Amino acid sequence: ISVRGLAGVENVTELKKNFNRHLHFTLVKDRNVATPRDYYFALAHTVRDHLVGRWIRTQQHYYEKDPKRIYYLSLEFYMGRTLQNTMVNLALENACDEATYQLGLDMEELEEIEEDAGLGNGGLGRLAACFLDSMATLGLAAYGYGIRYEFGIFNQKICGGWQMEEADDWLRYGNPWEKARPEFTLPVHFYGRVEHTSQGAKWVDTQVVLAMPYDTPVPGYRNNVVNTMRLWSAKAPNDFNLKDFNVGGYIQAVLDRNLAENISRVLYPNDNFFEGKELRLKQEYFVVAATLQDIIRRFKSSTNFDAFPDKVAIQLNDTHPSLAIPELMRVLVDLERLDWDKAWEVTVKTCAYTNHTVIPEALERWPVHLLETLLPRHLQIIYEINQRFLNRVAAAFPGDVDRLRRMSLVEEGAVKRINMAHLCIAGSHAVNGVARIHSEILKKTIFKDFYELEPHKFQNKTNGITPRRWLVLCNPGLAEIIAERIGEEYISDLDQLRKLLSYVDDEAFIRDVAKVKQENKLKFAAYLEREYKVHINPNSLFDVQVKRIHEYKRQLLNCLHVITLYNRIKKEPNKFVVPRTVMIGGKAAPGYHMAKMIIKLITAIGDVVNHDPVVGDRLRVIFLENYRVSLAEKVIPAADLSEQISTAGTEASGTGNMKFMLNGALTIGTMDGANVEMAEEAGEENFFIFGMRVEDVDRLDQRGYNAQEYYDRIPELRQIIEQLSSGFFSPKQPDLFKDIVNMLMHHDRFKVFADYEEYVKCQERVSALYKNPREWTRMVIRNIATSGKFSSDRTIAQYAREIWGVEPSRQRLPAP
Amino acid sequence: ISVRGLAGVENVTELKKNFNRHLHFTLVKDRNVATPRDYYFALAHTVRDHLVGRWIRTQQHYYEKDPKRIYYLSLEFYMGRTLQNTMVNLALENACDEATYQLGLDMEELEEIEEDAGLGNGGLGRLAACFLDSMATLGLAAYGYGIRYEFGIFNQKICGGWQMEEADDWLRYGNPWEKARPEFTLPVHFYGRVEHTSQGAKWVDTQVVLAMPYDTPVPGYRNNVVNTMRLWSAKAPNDFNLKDFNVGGYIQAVLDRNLAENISRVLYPNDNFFEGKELRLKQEYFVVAATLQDIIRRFKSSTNFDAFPDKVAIQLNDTHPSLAIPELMRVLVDLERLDWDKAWEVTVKTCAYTNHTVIPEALERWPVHLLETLLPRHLQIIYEINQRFLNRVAAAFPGDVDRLRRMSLVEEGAVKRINMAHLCIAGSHAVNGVARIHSEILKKTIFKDFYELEPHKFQNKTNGITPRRWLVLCNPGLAEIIAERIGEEYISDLDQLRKLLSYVDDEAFIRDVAKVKQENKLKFAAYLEREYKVHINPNSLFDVQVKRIHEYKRQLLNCLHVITLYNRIKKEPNKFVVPRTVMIGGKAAPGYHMAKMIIKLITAIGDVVNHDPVVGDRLRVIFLENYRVSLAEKVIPAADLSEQISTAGTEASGTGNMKFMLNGALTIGTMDGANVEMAEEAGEENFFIFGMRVEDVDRLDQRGYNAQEYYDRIPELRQIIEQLSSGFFSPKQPDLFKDIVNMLMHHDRFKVFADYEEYVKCQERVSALYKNPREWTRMVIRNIATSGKFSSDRTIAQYAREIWGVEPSRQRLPAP
Ligand SMILES: O=C(O)CCCOc1ccc(NC(=O)NC(=O)c2ccc(Cl)cc2Cl)c(Cl)c1
Ligand SMILES: O=C(O)CCCOc1ccc(NC(=O)NC(=O)c2ccc(Cl)cc2Cl)c(Cl)c1
Ligand SMILES: *Cc1c(COP(=O)(O)O)cnc(C)c1O
Ligand SMILES: *Cc1c(COP(=O)(O)O)cnc(C)c1O
C-alpha cells in the first residue's frame, strides 16, 4: 500500500484491541448488533485516543515556555470530516486500514459515516480551517476561536430542479472529537445601560448569557503538535432566567431559556452578503466577549498590560469579530482602569484585520439604533474612537472636509450606521488583502484615504490551502507517484513540487499522472451512480465549476457556453466534438432569489440536453447536489477543467482554484483574484486566460455597459436569449426565466455578455488540447509542479513573520 | 471497614489504573489540573465500565430465553444519584473506597459532586425508582419507560423566608450513566384529522415529532442482572420543520424547532394536583406512543397477537400513561387490522392500572376539545370504548340510569371532559390501591360502581421501599451492626429482620443501635453547619417532617405544636422540657399559593423561636432547603421522630414513613395510608398513633366541621391563632398570615383543629419516652425488626405473581 504510513505488527494489534475495547465499553455493543455507525465510532474513539497524549503535552508545553499566543477569531470554521485528516497527520492511515481489514471491515465505508462539521459558508470559513492546520504544522501556539452552532450550513436538496433547504443536525448522533470544558464557562452581557460615576463608566442592568467552551484538537502534520479550536455554546443562567419574579409562569420561564440559547443555534447561510439582523450582531459580540475574557485570563497567568501585545496576537477574520476592538478597550479602560491612550496603544498593537471582499453588499454597516440598544457602552467607545481618529485626519489633511466624512466610522443618511471595516482599519496595526490584485485594489480604491493616512498598515497575504487535506487525503494516488520520484518532504514543504518540472518529458511519469486522473474520474463516476444514480461517461472531459452560487461568480456565463455547445451540436449533428461532462455545484443563500433561479436554469438545461438523442454521450449537464467540503474532496481530484470565471475585480482571491491546480486540472478563467498569481507561477502559456482585465471593466463602466450591443452583434448569443425567453428550456412555464433574461439585458452588474465571445473562443482551445492527451498531461504537470506557492504553510509563515511577530518551526515536539 | 464488599488486591490495583486511564483518555486531564469534578467523572466511568459487560449479557439473555416482559410506564422516575447505588449493588464500594484512598482522594467528597436525577415530584416518582431496583434484584425482564426531561424538579432556594424556584440543569456537565440509542429513534404524531376509508380509518395530515431513546442501566443487587430504563427525548425532524415551504424565514424555521422539542424540556412540578395544560397532554401521548412502538417491535421479533398478553405486561403508574389503552387499540385496529373485540381482549389482558390518590383535584379530567384537536383518532376510540362499556353496565343494572352517567368515561357539564381514571379501569384487567386502607376506600367510595360491575379487577399492593438505597447505602453503620448478628441475607430478604427481635434485651445491641443513631445525628448536625451554616444541638430530639408541602399532609398541624411548645416555655421558663430540633422540609408547587405561605410561616416561626434567649437550646425550628432524594438519604438516618400526620383517609400510602421505620426513628402519626399496616406490624404499643380515624372524619362531615368550636374550647389554640392574627410572627407585616388564619377558621378541608388536642397530648408521651434512652431504643428495635414487610421486593413479588403472571427469581446470572 501507499505512503499512508507503516502498518507495524505491534501497532495493528494494539489498534484492534482498542477498537474492540471501545465497541464493548464505549458503544456497549457486541459484534452481533453493532451497526456500521457503531464501527465508525469505535474507530474514531480509538484514533482520538492517540492524540490526547500529545494534546496534553502540547498545551502543557505552551504553559511552561510561555510563547506569544496567536488567536484566530472567526465566525466560521468550515472543517469537514476529521477522522481521516487525523489519521493522516498522525501517520495512522495504513495501520488503521490494516487493522480494520483484519476485523473484517472497510475503513472507507466507515469514513463515509462521519458527518461534516459544516460550520462555514464557503471560502472565508474554509480558509480558517486550512490556517488552523498550517499553524499546528508550523508549531505556532495558536488557538481557533468561534461559535459552536448546533446547526451548520443547511443541507441542499434538489426538488423538481429547485433547491430545498433542510436543517443540518450534525450533532444528532454526537461528536467524538469535541470535549466540553464547563470549568471555563464565562458570562456575556447584553443590553443594560451606562452609569457614569466618579471613577469611570459602568455597564449596568445587563442580561446575562453564559458561554460554555468546547475544545476540539487540531493536530499538526507528523510533528506531535496538537493545538486547540475552542468553540462557544450559549447557555442560559438558571437564576434570572427564572428568578426575575412576579408572575409569568414557571413552565414558561423554563421554556423561555431557549431565547438566550438561540445565539449559538444556527449559522447564517450568507456568503459575501450582509444581513443586519439582531441575532447576527449577538453572535458576533458573544464570540468576541467570551474569547477576550479567556485570552486575558490566560495572560494574567503567563498587572502591566504594556507586555500584552508581546504575548498576544488576535487576528480578525473579516469584520465579523470587529467588536473585539471596542470590547478590548472597554475591559482595559472600564475594568482594568488604564488611561485611554495607553489602552488604545495596546489594542492597536495586538489587533490585525483581514479583508475578504470589495463588493458593497458584503460590507458590514450596523444601524446605530441597534448598537445603542444592545451594546450601549460599545457605541460610546466607538464614537470616542471615531472622534480621536478624525482629529488625526484633520491634522494630516487640513481643510479636507470631504475626506473627513468619507473616513468616518459613522455613516450619516437615512439611518446612521457604523462602518465596521473603518473601525477595523483604525484599531489594527495591520490590514491585509487576500491576493496581490485584491490588496492593490484596496489601496487604490476602497481604502485609498486610509492608505494615504497610514501606508504602513496595508499588506498582502495571498491565500493558500493545506496540502494535507487537499492532496494527501483526497488524492493519495497522485501524492504517491509524486513521492515515488521526489520523496515525502514536499507535504510540509510544497515548494519542492518544482522538482517535478524535470519529469515533464518523462514517459513513465506522464503515463502515471494520466493514470491517477483516470482512476479518480472512474471512482467519481461510480460514486455518482451509487449515491445519486443516472450515469455519465468517464472518457469525456470533466468540466467542473463548484463554489457558492453568486452572480459575480458567473455560473450564468458557464450556462451560456453549455447552451452554445448544445446548439452547435444540433446544427451539425454528425460533426465530431470533444465529449464533455460539465458539472456545476454550489448552494445559494435561502433569501437569494437570483441565485436560486440560476440553480433551476442549470437543472433545466440538463433536462433538455441530457435527454436529446442526437446529443448522445457527447454532452451531459449535471448539477452537483449539496456541495460541501467532503464532496469537494471527491470532485476536485476527478476534474480536468476548473472554472474560475468571475468578472475581473470581484473575486478577492478564491481558494477552490488552488485546490484544482494541485490536483491535475487545467484552469480556464479571468485575470481575477489569485488566478493572476497562479498563471504567473505556471506561465500564462500553461493557463487558459480570457476576458476583460480590471482596467477593461473600468473602461466599460466609464462609457457605460449596454448588453443590447452584444445581443445585437452576436447571433449565437441572441439565439440563446430567445430560447430562454420563448420557453425552450421551460415548456410548461414559458416565462419561467424572464427574471434572468431581464437582468442579463438591463441590470447586469457583472457584464456576462462582455466576456461571452472571448469565453467560448478560449473554450475551443481547451477542447483542442484535450484532443492531445500527451500535451494536456504535460501542461498539467507544469501546473502541479508550480503550485507550491499556494500552500497555507507559506501564507501562515508570512502572517507569523510580517504581522504576528513569531517564528515558525518545523520541530517535532518531544514524542507523545 | 464494613461489609461494603471486599477490597481485593488485584481489584484495587485494576480499579486504580482504570481510574487513571479515564482521567487521561476520557477527561483528557492530568493530575495537575484535574478538578474534583474530573475525579468524580473518572470514577463514574470506571464504575460504569463494570456493569456494561453484565448489561449486554442480561439483554442478550432475555433475547435468547424470551420471557414475558414487564413494561413500567411512568412520567416520573425519581432516581437521585447513581454512583454509590451502583457500587453497592456490584459490591464495589470498599474496593473503590480503598483505591481512591491510595490515589489520595476522598470517595465521599467525590460522591457529593454527582447531580441528582430529579425526574420526579415525590412519592409516585420515587416508587417507580424503588420498583426498578427491585425488579432487577428479583430477576424480572423489566423495562422502565419514561421521558428524559432536561430540567427535572426545580431547585428550591429560600429568600427572606420565601421559596424561590430555579431551573434544574442536571445535564449541564453531562450524564455518564446514560447512552443515546439513535438507531431506535421513532416518530410520534400530533394533530391531523381522521379519514374514514373503505377498509378502515386513517390518521392523516399529522405533525411529526421524533422520539430518541436514552438507556440507563438498572443493576440488580449482587445477582449480575442489569435491566434498562429507557427515557425518550423529543427531536424535531429536519424536513417539514423546515420543508413546509412558501416564505417565513429560514433562520426562523430552524429556531422554531424548539417547539416540538419543548415536549421533553421540563417536568411539571405538581404533586397530587392536576393542571390541564396542552404541553402536559403532549408529554403523556409522546411517552405512550413511542413506548408502544418499541414494545411491539420487540414482540414482532421474539402475526397472531393472541399471544401478545403472554409476552407483554404494561403497568400504568397512575393515569398519566392512560392513553396507552386507546393507543394500543389504534395500532391493533387501524394498523394491524384486528377486529375491535379481539383487539380489546388483547388490550385489557396486557394493561394494569395503579391508583395513587383519592383527592379530586389530583384526578385527570381532560377537556374533550383538547383531545379533539391534538388526538382526533384517540377521542373516537375513547367514545367507542365508552359506548360498549356503558352497554355492559346497562345490561348488568337494567334501568339504573344514574349509574350510567356516574360510570361514563365522558363527563357532561360546563365543558365535556374525559375521566382518565374510568378509562384505565375499563381497559385494564387489574386495578390496585397502594395500601390496604386506600384499596378499601377505592371499593367503598371512589370506584364503588366499578367494583360492583367487576369485583375481580380490584386488588391491593401495599407500597414498599428498596432496602439497598434506603438502608445499606444511606445507613451503612446500622446495616453493619445488624449484619454482625444476623448476616447479610436480609438485604434481599428483609423479612429476616424479625430475627432482631431476639436482641431486644441484648445490652450490647441496645448500645450499638443507639450509637449509630448518635453518630448519624452528629454527621447531619455537621453537614448542617458545613453547607447551610447556623448550629443545632445533637443531643436534642430530632423531630422531622420531610415531604412535599401540602395542606393534606398538615405541615400546619406540626406548626401549631411547635408554637405550643414555644408558648409553654415562655410561660414557665425554668421548667425542664426535653430539648427538640424540629426540622420541616419539602417543596411547594410554584402555583400553590397556600403551600408557599406555609413555608413562610415555618421560617417565620424559626425567626422568633431560634433567637429567643429564654428558649436557649431547648427548641430550634429549622426549614430543610431543597429536599430531594440525596438530602433524604442524609436526614432520615439521623431522625428520632418521624411525622406522618395527614388527615385520616387522604394519604393513599406514603413511603417516607417506611424509610424512617427502617432507620431507627419512632413514628407519630394518624391511622392513614400505610401507617396502619406499620403499626399493625410493629404493634400499636410501639407506635405513637393519635387523632381521628377515617370514620371519625366522616362522622364530622355528616354533622359538619366548624373550626370555631375548637377555637372556643381550647385556650392554647386560641392563643396561637391570635398570635398569627396580631403579627406576633410577622412584625413588619402584621396581616401577612391572614390567608392561613382565614382558611384554618373557615375553609379547612383537612380539619387541622380537630386533631390538635390529641396531637399535642401524644407529643407529650414521646417526650416522656425519650427521657428513657434504654426504653426508647428498645421500642426502636421493635420497629426496625418489624419493618421487613415494607420492602419493595415484597411489593414486586406480589405484582409479579398476582398481576403480571411472572415468577420472581433470586438466581445469579452467569457472571459478567
Ligand atoms: O444472532 C446472533 O448474533 C445471536 C444472538 C445475539 O443476541 C444479542 C447480542 C447482543 C445484544 N446486545 C448488545 O450487545 N448490547 C445491548 O443490548 C446494549 C446496547 C446499548 C446499550 Cl446503551 C446497552 C445495551 Cl445492554 C443483544 Cl440484546 C442480543
Ligand atoms: O504546577 C504544575 O502542576 C506544573 C505545570 C503543569 O502544567 C500543566 C499540566 C497539565 C495541563 N493540561 C492538561 O492536562 N490537559 C489539558 O490542557 C486539556 C484538557 C482538556 C482537553 Cl479537552 C484538552 C486538553 Cl489539551 C496543562 Cl495546560 C499544564
Ligand atoms: C474551497 C471551498 C470553497 C471556496 O471555493 P471558491 O471557488 O474559492 O469560492 C467553498 N466551499 C467549499 C466546500 C470549499 O471546499
Ligand atoms: C420517599 C420520598 C418522598 C415521599 O415521601 P412521603 O412522606 O410518602 O410523601 C418524597 N420525596 C422524596 C425526596 C423522597 O425520598
From Swiss-Prot, chains A, B:
GO biological process, one term: glycogen catabolic process
Pfam family, any one: Phosphorylase
A GO MF label: glycogen phosphorylase activity
Chain sites annotated for binding AMP: 30, 63, 297-302
Modified residues (N6-(pyridoxal phosphate)lysine): 659
Keywords: Acetylation, Allosteric enzyme, Carbohydrate metabolism, Glycogen metabolism, Glycosyltransferase, Nucleotide-binding, Phosphoprotein, Pyridoxal phosphate, Transferase
Residues the UniProt record annotates as site (Can be labeled by an AMP analog): 143
PROSITE patterns (alphabetical): PHOSPHORYLASE
Cofactor requirements of the protein: pyridoxal 5'-phosphate
Activity regulation, free text: Allosterically regulated through the non-covalent binding of metabolites, being activated by AMP and inhibited by ATP, ADP, and glucose-6-phosphate. The activity is also controlled by post-translational modifications including phosphorylation.
GO cellular component: skeletal muscle myofibril
Domain of life: Eukaryota
EC number annotated for this UniProt entry: 2.4.1.1
Post-translational modification: Phosphorylation of Ser-2 converts phosphorylase B (unphosphorylated) to phosphorylase A.
Site location (Involved in the association of subunits): 96, 130
Residues modified as Phosphotyrosine: 191, 214, 451
Reaction it catalyzes: [(1->4)-alpha-D-glucosyl](n) + phosphate = [(1->4)-alpha-D-glucosyl](n-1) + alpha-D-glucose 1-phosphate
Role description: Allosteric enzyme that catalyzes the rate-limiting step in glycogen catabolism, the phosphorolytic cleavage of glycogen to produce glucose-1-phosphate, and plays a central role in maintaining cellular and organismal glucose homeostasis.
Subunit field text: Homodimer. Homotetramer; to form the enzymatically active phosphorylase A.
Protein's name in the database: Glycogen phosphorylase, muscle form
Gene encoding the protein: PYGM
